[PDB]
Design a protein around this ligand. Sequence first.
Ligand SMILES: COc1cc(C(=O)N2CCC(N3CCN(C)CC3)CC2)ccc1Nc1ncc2c(n1)N(C)c1ccccc1C(=O)N2C
Ligand SMILES: COc1cc(C(=O)N2CCC(N3CCN(C)CC3)CC2)ccc1Nc1ncc2c(n1)N(C)c1ccccc1C(=O)N2C
Length: 112
Amino acid sequence: GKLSEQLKHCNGILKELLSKKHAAYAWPFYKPVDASALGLHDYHDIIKHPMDLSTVKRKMENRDYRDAQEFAADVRLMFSNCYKYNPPDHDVVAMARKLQDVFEFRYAKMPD
Ligand SMILES: COc1cc(C(=O)N2CCC(N3CCN(C)CC3)CC2)ccc1Nc1ncc2c(n1)N(C)c1ccccc1C(=O)N2C
Ligand SMILES: COc1cc(C(=O)N2CCC(N3CCN(C)CC3)CC2)ccc1Nc1ncc2c(n1)N(C)c1ccccc1C(=O)N2C
């Protein structure tokens, strides 16, 4: 009921984050970090709980999220992992912040 409706809002946000109008800055978050492929041989020493939008999408499709808060927690974990790993002046941090602005402003419109 209310929870289904809230997760519908989450699915709409997720669709938007994956949409072409944000693709120029959303792309680092589309898939799990392949640390070896990117040469980030310290990534898994620093980041204990990787997260990315394709994993959020699979969990949404599979009904893993019991409420909107767990969905939001995973999206914020993905952004926090990016802020944890990188210097504050890094290009990817600016990209994360722009996509997080999109996320937080629409998440705040949650029906209640
Ligand atoms: C698998 O996704 C990646 C692709 C590429 C790559 O080959 N590119 C970059 C994007 C470009 N596309 C852009 C969109 N366009 C529609 C199609 C073409 C094509 C050329 C480069 C990196 C990719 N993955 C990626 N994962 C996690 C990172 C990270 N980078 N950012 C940039 C980081 C960089 C350094 C240190 C940390 C990170 C990081 O935090 N994340 C989340
Ligand atoms: C480590 O970070 C990057 C790496 C590469 C790259 O050449 N790769 C990484 C992906 C590729 N792997 C794929 C799988 N395979 C096993 C082999 C390894 C190997 C070659 C390319 C881009 C990287 N980071 C990056 N950050 C911000 C951008 C930007 N570019 N530019 C290029 C953009 C490209 C498209 C749209 C926007 C941007 C952009 O604005 N920024 C700021």
